[PDB]
Amino acid sequence: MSKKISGGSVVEMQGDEMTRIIWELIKEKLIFPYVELDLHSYDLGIENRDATNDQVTKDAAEAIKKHNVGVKCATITPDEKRVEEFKLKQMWKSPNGTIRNILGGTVFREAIICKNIPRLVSGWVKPIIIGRHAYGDQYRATDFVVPGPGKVEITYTPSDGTQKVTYLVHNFEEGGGVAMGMYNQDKSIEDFAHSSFQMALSKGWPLYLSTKNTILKKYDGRFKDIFQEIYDKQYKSQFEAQKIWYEHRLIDDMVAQAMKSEGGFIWACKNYDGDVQSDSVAQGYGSLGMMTSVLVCPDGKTVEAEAAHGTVTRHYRMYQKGQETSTNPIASIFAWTRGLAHRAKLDNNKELAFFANALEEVSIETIEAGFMTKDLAACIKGLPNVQRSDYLNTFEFMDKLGENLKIKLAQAKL
Amino acid sequence: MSKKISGGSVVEMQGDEMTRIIWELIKEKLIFPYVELDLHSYDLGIENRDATNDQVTKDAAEAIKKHNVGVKCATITPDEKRVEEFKLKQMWKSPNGTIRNILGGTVFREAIICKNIPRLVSGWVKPIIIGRHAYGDQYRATDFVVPGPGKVEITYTPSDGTQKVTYLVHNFEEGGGVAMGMYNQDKSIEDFAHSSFQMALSKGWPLYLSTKNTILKKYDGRFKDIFQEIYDKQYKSQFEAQKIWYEHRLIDDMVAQAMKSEGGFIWACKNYDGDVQSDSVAQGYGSLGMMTSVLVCPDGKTVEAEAAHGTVTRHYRMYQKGQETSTNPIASIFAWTRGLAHRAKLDNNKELAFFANALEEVSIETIEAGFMTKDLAACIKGLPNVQRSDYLNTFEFMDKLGENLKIKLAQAKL
Ligand SMILES: NC(=O)c1ccc[n+]([C@@H]2O[C@H](COP(=O)([O-])OP(=O)(O)OC[C@H]3O[C@@H](n4cnc5c(N)ncnc54)[C@H](OP(=O)(O)O)[C@@H]3O)[C@@H](O)[C@H]2O)c1
Numbered sequence: 001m002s003k004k005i006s007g008g009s010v011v012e013m014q015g016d017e018m019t020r021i022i023w024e025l026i027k028e029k030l031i032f033p034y035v036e037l038d039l040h041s042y043d044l045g046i047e048n049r050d051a052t053n054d055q056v057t058k059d060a061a062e063a064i065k066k067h068n069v070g071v072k073c074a075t076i077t078p079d080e081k082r083v084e085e086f087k088l089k090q091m092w093k094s095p096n097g098t099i100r101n102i103l104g105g106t107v108f109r110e111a112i113i114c115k116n117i118p119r120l121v122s123g124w125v126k127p128i129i130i131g132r133h134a135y136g137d138q139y140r141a142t143d144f145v146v147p148g149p150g151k152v153e154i155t156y157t158p159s160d161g162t163q164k165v166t167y168l169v170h171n172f173e174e175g176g177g178v179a180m181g182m183y184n185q186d187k188s189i190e191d192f193a194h195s196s197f198q199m200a201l202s203k204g205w206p207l208y209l210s211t212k213n214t215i216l217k218k219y220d221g222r223f224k225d226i227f228q229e230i231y232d233k234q235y236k237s238q239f240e241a242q243k244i245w246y247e248h249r250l251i252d253d254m255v256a257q258a259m260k261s262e263g264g265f266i267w268a269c270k271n272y273d274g275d276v277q278s279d280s281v282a283q284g285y286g287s288l289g290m291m292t293s294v295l296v297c298p299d300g301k302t303v304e305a306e307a308a309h310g311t312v313t314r315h316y317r318m319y320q321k322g323q324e325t326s327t328n329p330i331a332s333i334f335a336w337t338r339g340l341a342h343r344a345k346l347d348n349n350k351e352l353a354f355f356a357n358a359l360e361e362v363s364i365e366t367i368e369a370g371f372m373t374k375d376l377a378a379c380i381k382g383l384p385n386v387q388r389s390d391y392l393n394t395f396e397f398m399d400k401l402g403e404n405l406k407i408k409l410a411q412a413k414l
Numbered sequence: 415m416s417k418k419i420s421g422g423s424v425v426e427m428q429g430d431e432m433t434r435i436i437w438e439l440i441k442e443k444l445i446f447p448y449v450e451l452d453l454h455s456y457d458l459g460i461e462n463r464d465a466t467n468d469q470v471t472k473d474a475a476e477a478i479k480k481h482n483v484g485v486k487c488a489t490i491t492p493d494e495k496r497v498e499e500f501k502l503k504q505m506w507k508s509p510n511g512t513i514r515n516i517l518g519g520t521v522f523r524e525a526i527i528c529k530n531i532p533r534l535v536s537g538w539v540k541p542i543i544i545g546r547h548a549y550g551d552q553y554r555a556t557d558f559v560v561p562g563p564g565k566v567e568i569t570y571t572p573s574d575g576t577q578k579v580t581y582l583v584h585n586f587e588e589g590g591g592v593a594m595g596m597y598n599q600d601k602s603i604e605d606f607a608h609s610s611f612q613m614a615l616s617k618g619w620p621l622y623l624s625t626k627n628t629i630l631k632k633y634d635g636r637f638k639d640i641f642q643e644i645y646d647k648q649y650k651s652q653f654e655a656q657k658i659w660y661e662h663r664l665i666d667d668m669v670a671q672a673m674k675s676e677g678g679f680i681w682a683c684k685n686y687d688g689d690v691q692s693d694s695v696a697q698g699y700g701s702l703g704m705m706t707s708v709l710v711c712p713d714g715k716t717v718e719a720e721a722a723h724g725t726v727t728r729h730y731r732m733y734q735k736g737q738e739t740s741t742n743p744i745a746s747i748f749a750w751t752r753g754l755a756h757r758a759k760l761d762n763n764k765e766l767a768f769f770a771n772a773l774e775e776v777s778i779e780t781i782e783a784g785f786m787t788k789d790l791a792a793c794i795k796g797l798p799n800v801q802r803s804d805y806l807n808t809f810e811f812m813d814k815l816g817e818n819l820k821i822k823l824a825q826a827k828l
């Protein structure tokens with residue numbers, strides 16, 4: 001167009017292996033040509049994390065907390081093999097954990113939808129954002145074995161020196177067993193609620209909290225009550241304003257309704273075992289290359305976007321041998337659009353906001369037009385039947401998006 | 415032909431609405447013309463359960479425990495609307511719960527496969543039986559709310575006065591929240607394992623056991639260990655003889671593995687509830703009318719079979735107005751075959767065993783020949799594209815299976 005859009009302040013974290021390659025391609029072909037940013041970029045590549053003794057990771061989280069918008073590229077989480085591969089000098093903790101443990105918030109995973117790409121439920125036309133309440137990786141489980149008869153109890157001792165309360169979870173009369181301890185601070189539940197409500201107002205969809213309060217009448221009921229409270233004291237007004245609404249459901253009714261729904265709703269959910277933050281998601285159904293992720297902070301201001309997958313090592317290896325690759329960039333691309341979309345919102349930057357949207361529509365439109373990477377072509381035909389003529393390589397795809405983006409932005413000039 | 419197959423003692427449970435109708439059809443058109451049974455019939459119809467203050471439900475459970483074979487028709491779980499519709503004098507509990515509660519066991523959900531009916535994975539050609547740990551009974555976690563700052567610790571107090579052990583669940587410093595303790599006796603794990611290993615032998619496929627032994631190194635470790643103990647010590651041999659095996663996994667991996675599989679295997683889940691993935695979808699994708707359910711007890715003798723779906727009220731309603739309906743009877747039919755097949759096994763009744771399998775083949779063969787109910791067809795062409803000539807009535811279909819069962823059994827004697 002004319003002058004690049006003044007995007008504002010954004011925090012960018014560079015990553016590793018395959019994602020680092022496509023990441024640079026995204027900035028070079030889809031972001032920089034149209035937006036000027038006051039970039040606070042930190043190199044979270046493994047060699048740099050090692051070199052700075054992981055100091056860069058903290059600095060990145062610090063930066064996000066302060067500039068509110070963070071976009072992250074996938075990073076290698078060291079294990080024995082990695083320690084050996086790069087001669088690391090210590091097994092560095094996952095940077096995703098370090099970041100999440102400093103900013104707090106709830107992660108919401110979404111799978112971009114395309115009409116010509118199969119969904120678990122054909123009827124799903126609009127996406128389904130899902131945020132699971134989970135402790136960070138800094139959480140340590142409290143489970144033991146119990147070898148033989150005896151009683152197991154759970155106890156609460158007020159710190160003000162008042163009557164101690166004991167409960168008796170189970171008395172093992174014969175044989176042994178196994179037992180767990182679990183907890184949740186009200187604050188965490190509030191945060192969970194806040195991040196959930198906001199998320200729904202930004203997207204413009206109805207929120208649904210699923211719990212199993214029928215069984216955990218006090219545990220889960222706690223979530224239910226705290227949601228309603230926060231929903232009435234604040235939010236409800238805006239939900240009605242935006243034609244949206246909040247509402248509770250028993251995990252059993254959700255999974256059923258969800259199966260008969262067309263989609264388009266925020267699904268916050270508390271599971272029996274609870275969950276713990278992890279880097280990976282779970283292959284499952286649908287291409288990981290289409291799985292977005294967003295760490296939404298309680299304050300309504302801070303947000304960190306990233307793809308749901310990892311660095312895609314296998315793909316990288318081939319790229320390292322000069323082999324042709326076909327890595328999906330949608331998930332990474334959406335990390336940028338969601339970040340810029342949030343940015344534009346905090347600053348009432350109409351232009352940037354339009355840009356953010358445009359890039360997503362072009363991403364989706366490009367695929368629905370028949371242009372896609374191998375992973376998607378395989379969702380349509382199945383690995384065995386997929387031919388090369390069925391897809392584009394990593395670079396050809398990036399090139400197609402950029403072309404279509406150029407067309408999209410020109411057409412909007414009217 | 416002449417003399418009918420002499421089946422043995424089978425406990426039957428009549429149900430409600432639409433299923434009650436297809437249930438009698440199955441009996442008149444598919445079972446009674448070829449098999450004489452020593453029937454212990456219990457009317458679990460909503461009106462009758464109400465008239466007997468639910469004593470019929472308990473007598474049926476008592477009867478199943480006695481004759482080891484029970485087939486069941488879908489039943490109505492009363493809710494407020496149901497209470498008002500039948501002027502119930504109490505909101506009766508799920509007869510399914512009362513029965514599993516009395517019998518104990520592990521429910522196995524298996525979807526019947528048909529070559530011309532789309533599946534989740536074009537690769538799955540063999541069934542994927544999913545069984546979940548049936549806590550039910552009076553088991554329950556001990557949850558409570560934490561008023562304010564204080565410590566919450568779980569304690570194990572040995573019977574042999576041995577060293578008492580204390581674990582800290584969490585120290586509420588901000589004060590406020592919720593906490594809880596969970597437990598599990600070795601026996602439950604054992605029964606679970608027994609039902610699993612057995613179920614993998616009845617069918618002829620390997621058996622996996624998914625777990626999160628990485629997060630809950632003690633709790634889940636117990637399942638892994640106990641499943642192996644009981645395996646080596648009681649099933650290793652038998653599995654070998656059938657060229658079958660057993661291994662442990664990780665939920666994350668299992669779900670992937672299944673996707674990239676051809677099917678044919680038993681999957682035992684320790685997992686709780688469902689979420690954003692193919693749980694209830696893996697066991698039964700598409701139509702609920704092909705979803706079977708089997709309760710297997712530890713004793714390897716008792717079994718309760720029933721369709722996974724419900725009474726199909728929507729169809730029953732149409733039927734009441736004299737509107738044509740197309741209700742899939744496949745699930746209901748397999749509840750009868752699995753049951754009779756088990757009767758046959760327990761009594762070395764080669765004729766009955768022949769009949770059971772014979773009836774299943776006819777069902778599947780009939781659908782693969784293009785004769786099916788509207789739920790299917792919809793799976794093929796999609797609701798919008800289904801035309802009347804694409805499927806059959808609840809009746810026209812039961813009729814088609816009748817003529818086909820006759821041939822099948824006729825040409826068998828020769
Ligand atoms: N920074 C993060 O958020 C994050 C998250 C998870 C993992 N990781 C890191 O990644 C490394 C291990 O990687 P991983 O094996 O778990 O990989 P991954 O990136 O999660 O994906 C594993 C497989 O998913 C498919 N896939 C994922 N993204 C794809 C895309 N964009 N396009 C096409 N196919 C895609 C590929 O299947 P095919 O091979 O069948 O094509 C690939 O082999 C570790 O160093 C780990 O710490 C980082």
Ligand SMILES: NC(=O)c1ccc[n+]([C@@H]2O[C@H](COP(=O)([O-])OP(=O)(O)OC[C@H]3O[C@@H](n4cnc5c(N)ncnc54)[C@H](OP(=O)(O)O)[C@@H]3O)[C@@H](O)[C@H]2O)c1
Nearest residue numbers: 488489490491702703723724725726727728741742743789
């Ligand atoms: N006894 C049990 O195991 C059990 C289990 C679940 C529910 N229920 C009871 O069923 C009643 C409510 O029923 P629900 O709404 O949950 O119904 P449902 O029987 O579970 O099925 C709901 C929908 O599934 C489809 N469907 C299910 N079985 C089908 C079949 N055999 N052939 C064709 N389509 C089939 C129909 O879709 P279309 O409407 O799109 O055709 C039907 O409306 C309650 O009284 C509830 O307690 C009993």
